[PDB]
Amino acid sequence: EVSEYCSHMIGSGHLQSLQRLIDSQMETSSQITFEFVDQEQLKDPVCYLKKAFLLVQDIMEDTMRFRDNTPNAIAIVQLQELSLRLKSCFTKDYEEHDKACVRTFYETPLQLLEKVKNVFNETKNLLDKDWNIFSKNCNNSFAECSSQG
Amino acid sequence: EVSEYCSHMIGSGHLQSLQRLIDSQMETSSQITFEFVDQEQLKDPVCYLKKAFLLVQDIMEDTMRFRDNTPNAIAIVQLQELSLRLKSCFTKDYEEHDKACVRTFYETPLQLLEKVKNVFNETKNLLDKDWNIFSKNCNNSFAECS
């Protein structure tokens, strides 16, 4: 079940952690490649975040990497712990729609980090309005995407 | 004027702060371009650091940029202040030789930060050995560079 366990689960400390993450990065024009949800393909706000929340998990595990026991590595662990708690708040969608709406991006680390912060921030905002919002069936939204990863 | 006060300017807090900078950088394939001293051209330890000390000031001003008032931006300002004090410890070498021993690098921000930390670390170490050491005339060392 999705349940009231979902409401208020993403806290302000989580967002401040994301912000300190962003603020400590040296500013660079250097771009990196990553997979993320293509907003131009998936425009519905709820299903965008349903898909994006899942990808953020891969992004944290493989891309947002820091030295053991540094403040930023600790924030990632907390965001991963938080994401595990959040997994019962997103209803599962069809497995045929796993790579739909995903594309490779060529963007700076700061732009990737802003995408991740926006996912956690907007997920928190919608959960605070309705703890059941991510029980939405997004199979038709994913089917309307033009491409796949 | 070079003086005994040189051996007291770079503190442990400056290095620990540099380490905290390094520890906060995300491990990523993102590489950046910068100008720095070539260790292969300038192998003499003292003249390497005379050259590297000047270049680190451009790197801090133009490349190691952080959003204003963040912990890392403040650390950079403090390292810049510290460098301003250290300039009394380095005698001038011929202007002749400004871009000598310098080449472009394409390395990660972590690698650049390690290069900067090593300059401050080795400078502190040598000043602790002879606070007059960077009065050395490095004009001939700079001349053998490519």
Tab-separated table of C-alpha atoms in Angstrom, chain A residues 23-28 110, chain B residues 25 57-68 70 72-73 76-77 80:
chain	number	residue	atom	x	y	z
A	23	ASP	CA	26.685	24.773	-3.359
A	24	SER	CA	29.932	22.912	-2.737
A	25	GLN	CA	30.522	22.030	-6.408
A	26	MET	CA	33.103	24.008	-8.330
A	27	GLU	CA	31.427	25.847	-11.188
A	28	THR	CA	32.402	24.457	-14.592
A	110	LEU	CA	25.415	21.311	-11.723
B	25	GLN	CA	33.734	17.624	-5.053
B	57	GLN	CA	46.664	33.020	-8.008
B	58	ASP	CA	45.194	33.038	-11.531
B	59	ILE	CA	43.617	29.639	-10.920
B	60	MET	CA	41.918	30.811	-7.739
B	61	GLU	CA	40.648	34.007	-9.369
B	62	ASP	CA	39.409	32.521	-12.654
B	63	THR	CA	38.909	28.755	-12.240
B	64	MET	CA	38.181	27.688	-8.612
B	65	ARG	CA	34.867	29.533	-8.582
B	66	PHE	CA	32.139	28.848	-6.019
B	67	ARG	CA	28.887	30.626	-5.352
B	68	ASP	CA	29.378	33.673	-3.148
B	70	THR	CA	29.365	29.313	0.509
B	72	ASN	CA	34.050	26.741	-0.329
B	73	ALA	CA	33.898	30.287	-1.745
B	76	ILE	CA	39.090	30.441	-1.607
B	77	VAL	CA	38.957	34.064	-0.414
B	80	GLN	CA	43.689	34.434	-1.753
